[PDB]
Symmetry: C2
Subunit: 125 residues, 2 copies
């Protein structure tokens, strides 16, 4: 049963798994036929193996991710604002997206879409 409480719990488990580099913990949140479109507009990775590799690549560098506002949960859907920070060659970068999950009956994520553009990437020189 998809209650706002469950969907909010899932967003928190997702954010925490990213921080820990827990690939199994992230993949376990998705339906086997789920899709990920990161960022919006590109072509969606489909299925368990594609999704795992995507995150395996994202987690090449250590990410510090945190929710910046309350999670919005309603009718099998959740949206949340957060920031992902990482350093590279002495430069600290902060990506500030808004993600959107859609859950299935079983309470698993069937689709994920990360919305952010160049104006949401904040890196120094």
């Amino acid at each position: 049963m998809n209650t706002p409480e469950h969907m909010t719990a899932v967003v928190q488990r997702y954010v925490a798994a990213l921080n820990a580099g827990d690939l199994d913990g992230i993949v376990a949140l998705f339906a086997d036929d789920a899709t990920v479109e990161d960022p919006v507009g590109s072509e969606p990775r489909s299925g368990t193996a594609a999704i795992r590799e995507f995150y395996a690549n994202s987690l090449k560098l250590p990410l510090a991710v945190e929710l910046t506002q309350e999670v919005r949960a309603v009718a099998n859907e959740a949206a949340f604002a957060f920031i992902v920070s990482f350093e590279y060659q002495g430069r600290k970068t902060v990506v500030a997206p808004i993600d959107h999950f859609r859950f299935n009956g079983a309470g698993k994520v069937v689709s994920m879409r990360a919305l952010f553009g160049e104006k949401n990437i904040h890196a120094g020189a």
Copy 2:
């Protein structure tokens, strides 16, 4: 041409029109065949006349709306966090949703979805 700058400008014009109770200014932002789903899950109002009435009802009470974070704009889509505040019978209420716009080629809004649930409605007693 839908540039992030245009889409961000539209979100700002939308938020300002709500604050002013400028119904023509809000409706002018949408495509004639646009849809509004407020909140997510319910049934979408379709077309210019339905959309105008919806907002005419929302604007029964004076709304104070403000963007709380940067607007996320990418590939014909924009998402933003904001709060709508209003008073009623001595009670101040704050709704904290995340809206999602999808633009057409002409740069007009073809669809709007407001995502927020009971946990995003913050009223006193």
